[PDB]
Design an enzyme around this catalytic site. Sequence first.
Site, mmCIF file in Angstrom:
data_model
loop_
_atom_site.group_PDB
_atom_site.id
_atom_site.type_symbol
_atom_site.label_atom_id
_atom_site.label_comp_id
_atom_site.label_asym_id
_atom_site.label_seq_id
_atom_site.Cartn_x
_atom_site.Cartn_y
_atom_site.Cartn_z
ATOM 1 N N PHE A 1 0.881 -1.486 -0.014
ATOM 2 C CA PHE A 1 -0.381 -0.285 0.126
ATOM 3 C C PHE A 1 0.860 1.063 0.275
ATOM 4 O O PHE A 1 1.134 1.768 -1.278
ATOM 5 C CB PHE A 1 -0.829 0.174 1.388
ATOM 6 C CG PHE A 1 -1.754 1.120 1.016
ATOM 7 C CD1 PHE A 1 -3.147 0.400 0.279
ATOM 8 C CD2 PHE A 1 -2.470 1.756 1.097
ATOM 9 C CE1 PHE A 1 -4.718 0.857 0.508
ATOM 10 C CE2 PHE A 1 -3.306 2.928 1.633
ATOM 11 C CZ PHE A 1 -4.417 2.320 0.713
ATOM 12 N N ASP A 2 2.052 1.559 0.918
ATOM 13 C CA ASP A 2 2.154 2.559 1.162
ATOM 14 C C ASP A 2 3.992 1.710 0.717
ATOM 15 O O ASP A 2 4.665 1.849 1.777
ATOM 16 C CB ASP A 2 2.368 3.364 2.636
ATOM 17 C CG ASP A 2 3.228 4.300 2.875
ATOM 18 O OD1 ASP A 2 3.859 4.904 1.003
ATOM 19 O OD2 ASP A 2 3.254 5.266 3.444
ATOM 20 N N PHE B 1 8.068 -5.452 -7.316
ATOM 21 C CA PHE B 1 8.641 -5.069 -6.147
ATOM 22 C C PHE B 1 9.106 -3.078 -6.850
ATOM 23 O O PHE B 1 10.720 -3.066 -7.169
ATOM 24 C CB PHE B 1 9.029 -5.658 -5.422
ATOM 25 C CG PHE B 1 9.579 -6.605 -4.859
ATOM 26 C CD1 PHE B 1 8.420 -7.209 -4.639
ATOM 27 C CD2 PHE B 1 10.395 -7.872 -4.218
ATOM 28 C CE1 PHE B 1 8.315 -7.795 -3.624
ATOM 29 C CE2 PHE B 1 9.891 -9.068 -3.544
ATOM 30 C CZ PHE B 1 9.175 -9.299 -3.225
ATOM 31 N N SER C 1 6.167 -13.653 -3.491
ATOM 32 C CA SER C 1 5.288 -12.884 -4.387
ATOM 33 C C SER C 1 5.958 -13.446 -5.541
ATOM 34 O O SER C 1 6.723 -14.610 -5.865
ATOM 35 C CB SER C 1 6.516 -11.610 -4.406
ATOM 36 O OG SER C 1 5.763 -10.472 -5.598
ATOM 37 N N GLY D 1 -8.389 -9.411 -2.837
ATOM 38 C CA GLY D 1 -9.710 -9.747 -2.471
ATOM 39 C C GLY D 1 -10.535 -10.858 -2.153
ATOM 40 O O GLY D 1 -10.260 -11.742 -1.292
ATOM 41 N N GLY E 1 -8.699 -10.566 2.187
ATOM 42 C CA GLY E 1 -10.412 -10.871 1.831
ATOM 43 C C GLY E 1 -11.362 -10.399 2.633
ATOM 44 O O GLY E 1 -12.095 -10.832 2.910
ATOM 45 N N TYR F 1 -5.687 -4.515 2.539
ATOM 46 C CA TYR F 1 -5.679 -3.406 1.456
ATOM 47 C C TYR F 1 -6.903 -4.069 0.400
ATOM 48 O O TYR F 1 -7.438 -2.548 -0.116
ATOM 49 C CB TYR F 1 -4.639 -5.089 0.780
ATOM 50 C CG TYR F 1 -3.728 -4.309 -0.849
ATOM 51 C CD1 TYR F 1 -4.576 -3.527 -1.895
ATOM 52 C CD2 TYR F 1 -2.382 -3.811 0.481
ATOM 53 C CE1 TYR F 1 -3.123 -2.676 -2.885
ATOM 54 C CE2 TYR F 1 -0.882 -3.209 -0.391
ATOM 55 C CZ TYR F 1 -2.592 -2.930 -1.682
ATOM 56 O OH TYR F 1 -1.481 -1.637 -2.953
HETATM 57 C C1 LIG Z 1 -1.554 -3.548 -6.212
HETATM 58 C C2 LIG Z 1 -0.501 -4.546 -5.396
HETATM 59 C C3 LIG Z 1 0.221 -4.495 -4.656
HETATM 60 C C4 LIG Z 1 0.405 -5.765 -3.713
HETATM 61 N N1 LIG Z 1 2.273 -5.540 -3.135
HETATM 62 C C5 LIG Z 1 2.995 -5.911 -1.481
HETATM 63 C C6 LIG Z 1 4.189 -6.335 -1.536
HETATM 64 O O1 LIG Z 1 4.899 -5.175 -2.083
HETATM 65 N N2 LIG Z 1 4.669 -6.591 -0.398
HETATM 66 C C7 LIG Z 1 3.364 -7.661 -0.151
HETATM 67 O O2 LIG Z 1 3.377 -8.450 1.361
HETATM 68 N N3 LIG Z 1 2.328 -7.831 -0.396
HETATM 69 C C8 LIG Z 1 1.793 -7.057 -1.625
HETATM 70 N N4 LIG Z 1 0.070 -6.821 -2.431
HETATM 71 C C9 LIG Z 1 -0.123 -8.040 -1.751
HETATM 72 C C10 LIG Z 1 -1.423 -7.714 0.591
HETATM 73 O O3 LIG Z 1 0.386 -7.404 1.000
HETATM 74 C C11 LIG Z 1 -2.081 -8.675 0.174
HETATM 75 O O4 LIG Z 1 -1.848 -9.855 1.122
HETATM 76 C C12 LIG Z 1 -3.129 -9.310 -0.773
HETATM 77 O O5 LIG Z 1 -3.226 -8.497 -1.323
HETATM 78 C C13 LIG Z 1 -4.177 -10.228 0.225
HETATM 79 O O6 LIG Z 1 -4.875 -9.334 1.278
HETATM 80 P P1 LIG Z 1 -6.330 -8.644 0.766
HETATM 81 O O7 LIG Z 1 -7.813 -9.514 -0.095
HETATM 82 O O8 LIG Z 1 -7.691 -7.829 1.599
HETATM 83 O O9 LIG Z 1 -6.422 -7.067 -0.520
HETATM 84 C C14 LIG Z 1 -0.225 -6.274 -2.982
HETATM 85 C C15 LIG Z 1 -1.375 -6.233 -3.249
HETATM 86 C C16 LIG Z 1 -1.885 -5.526 -4.467
HETATM 87 C C17 LIG Z 1 -2.893 -5.137 -4.353
HETATM 88 C C1 LIG Z 2 -2.204 3.236 -2.021
HETATM 89 C C2 LIG Z 2 -2.506 1.823 -2.676
HETATM 90 O O1 LIG Z 2 -3.850 2.521 -3.596
HETATM 91 C C3 LIG Z 2 -4.921 1.649 -4.214
HETATM 92 C C4 LIG Z 2 -4.150 0.452 -4.805
HETATM 93 C C5 LIG Z 2 -4.627 0.163 -5.994
HETATM 94 C C6 LIG Z 2 -5.868 0.247 -6.757
HETATM 95 C C7 LIG Z 2 -6.342 1.736 -6.880
HETATM 96 O O2 LIG Z 2 -7.207 1.830 -7.494
HETATM 97 C C8 LIG Z 2 -7.230 2.295 -5.920
HETATM 98 C C9 LIG Z 2 -8.238 2.880 -4.840
HETATM 99 C C10 LIG Z 2 -9.552 2.603 -5.833
HETATM 100 N N1 LIG Z 2 -7.593 3.070 -3.787
HETATM 101 C C11 LIG Z 2 -9.167 3.582 -2.823
HETATM 102 C C12 LIG Z 2 -9.313 5.201 -3.102
HETATM 103 C C13 LIG Z 2 -8.188 5.887 -4.031
HETATM 104 C C14 LIG Z 2 -8.537 7.523 -4.261
HETATM 105 C C15 LIG Z 2 -8.886 8.116 -3.384
HETATM 106 CL CL1 LIG Z 2 -8.970 10.300 -3.975
HETATM 107 C C16 LIG Z 2 -9.654 7.564 -2.915
HETATM 108 C C17 LIG Z 2 -9.926 6.282 -2.489
HETATM 109 C C18 LIG Z 2 -6.780 3.032 -3.109
HETATM 110 C C19 LIG Z 2 -6.011 3.650 -1.829
HETATM 111 C C20 LIG Z 2 -6.150 1.825 -4.010
HETATM 112 O O1 LIG Z 3 4.857 -5.121 -6.064
HETATM 113 C C1 LIG Z 3 4.688 -7.088 -6.342
HETATM 114 O O2 LIG Z 3 5.129 -7.756 -7.526
HETATM 115 C C2 LIG Z 3 4.512 -7.354 -5.357
HETATM 116 C C3 LIG Z 3 4.469 -8.293 -4.100
HETATM 117 C C4 LIG Z 3 4.016 -9.649 -3.408
HETATM 118 O O3 LIG Z 3 4.209 -9.703 -2.561
HETATM 119 N N1 LIG Z 3 2.865 -9.101 -3.514
HETATM 120 C C5 LIG Z 3 1.772 -8.750 -5.114
HETATM 121 O O4 LIG Z 3 0.771 -9.095 -5.377
HETATM 122 N N2 LIG Z 3 2.599 -8.213 -5.690
#
Ligand SMILES: Cc1cc2nc3c(=O)[nH]c(=O)nc-3n(C[C@H](O)[C@H](O)[C@H](O)COP(=O)(O)O)c2cc1C
Ligand SMILES: CCOc1cccc(=O)c2c(C)n(Cc3ccc(Cl)cc3)c(C)c12
Ligand SMILES: O=C(O)c1cc(=O)[nH]c(=O)[nH]1
Length: 371
Positions: A63-64, A114, A181, A282, A311, A332
């Site tokens: 996320f961050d 990454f 990953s 998700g 999820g 997430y």
């Molecule tokens: C765009 C995106 C980038 C991700 N990057 C990472 C990452 O840098 N490191 C990691 O451990 N997991 C990463 N994840 C996986 C999440 O940490 C998380 O385990 C996964 O999305 C399942 O959670 P959720 O179903 O609640 O979204 C990423 C997921 C998304 C959608």
């Molecule tokens: C910091 C990680 O941000 C995201 C990751 C992935 C998909 C997206 O399209 C994302 C979306 C729709 N959102 C929600 C969101 C994004 C922007 C605003 Cl202004 C309000 C809510 C996040 C946080 C997203």
């Molecule tokens: O940044 C990525 O490629 C990433 C890392 C991770 O652990 N999981 C994911 O789905 N993406």
Amino acid sequence: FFLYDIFLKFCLKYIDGEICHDLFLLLGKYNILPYDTSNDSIYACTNIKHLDFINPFGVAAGFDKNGVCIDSILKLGFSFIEIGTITPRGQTGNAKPRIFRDVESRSIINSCGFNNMGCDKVTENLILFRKRQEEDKLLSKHIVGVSIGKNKDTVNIVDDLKYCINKIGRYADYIAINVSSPNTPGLRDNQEAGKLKNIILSVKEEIDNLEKNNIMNFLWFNTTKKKPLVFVKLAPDLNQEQKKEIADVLLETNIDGMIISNTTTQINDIKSFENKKGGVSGAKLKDISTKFICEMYNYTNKQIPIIASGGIFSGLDALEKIEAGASVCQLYSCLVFNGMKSAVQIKRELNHLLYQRGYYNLKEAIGRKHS
Ligand SMILES: Cc1cc2nc3c(=O)[nH]c(=O)nc-3n(C[C@H](O)[C@H](O)[C@H](O)COP(=O)(O)O)c2cc1C
Ligand SMILES: CCOc1cccc(=O)c2c(C)n(Cc3ccc(Cl)cc3)c(C)c12
Ligand SMILES: O=C(O)c1cc(=O)[nH]c(=O)[nH]1
């Protein structure tokens, strides 16, 4: 606190995935995101050893990625954040577009690879936060973990993890070893018993070595003021032999906790993701993950605490993960599909549900499905 839901529904309609991601990190950069200074339930408290979480909800890794929004994201009502995944050198990551969403099923697919500013630039940002944290009484209790991985071209993980620990270890409440990953080949091959045992013991040895290199007690510039805990994030795409083999390693090496799980490459039941490549997050990942928590909580004979992901969108989703064996919950896709309300809402639902089921506190519900 409604304007955001007009913004969100619009974002999910006409705006690209990563543009929303870079837009959300923009709002928090200039600290114009909403706050949640509202006190959390003492019955919703949880812990992993000395790690004491104000509530059981935190933000998953990715996320961050760079830790540019730590304070902003925490202030939305989360107890912790996992920054990263970070690599020694910064990476652009894989080709764009690389984040896509299916609202209908509440799912995401990603092939990020990454993408980060590197270990050194992320450390610079974490030191900034830890400095803000000293002055601030509000972020005094919030946990900040770091997810560490390897550069694509790194011919040996250990070297890349030994570098990150030596740089960022001092400022982390816990370290998350990313060997799960699916978008960086072939990091998952490190989940084999032999390879994983060497990784875990090398990382733990490096953490131990930071202390063994100064008289400073001052040394730990984190929330706990204690050496970071070592966690491992696992992929759900494993067989039963592989899972039992890992369980036996996590017991011998004395890993502090396990993040079950990362994204999945098993889902083929999404039309919008047919052409697309990456790992699925998700709602479509919820059932797999909860089943995987059960298996690992039984295999490690309840000895290794679990961090659940994902999820998780409701209080029932949260209690489902907790009753299966998890102590904390990382979010997430909830932040992607529900937006800013996410923490505030998920925290309400869980307290409402914990009362309804007949629990004094969260701790009492942990692993309740096993009996
Ligand atoms: C765009 C995106 C980038 C991700 N990057 C990472 C990452 O840098 N490191 C990691 O451990 N997991 C990463 N994840 C996986 C999440 O940490 C998380 O385990 C996964 O999305 C399942 O959670 P959720 O179903 O609640 O979204 C990423 C997921 C998304 C959608
Ligand atoms: C910091 C990680 O941000 C995201 C990751 C992935 C998909 C997206 O399209 C994302 C979306 C729709 N959102 C929600 C969101 C994004 C922007 C605003 Cl202004 C309000 C809510 C996040 C946080 C997203
Ligand atoms: O940044 C990525 O490629 C990433 C890392 C991770 O652990 N999981 C994911 O789905 N993406």
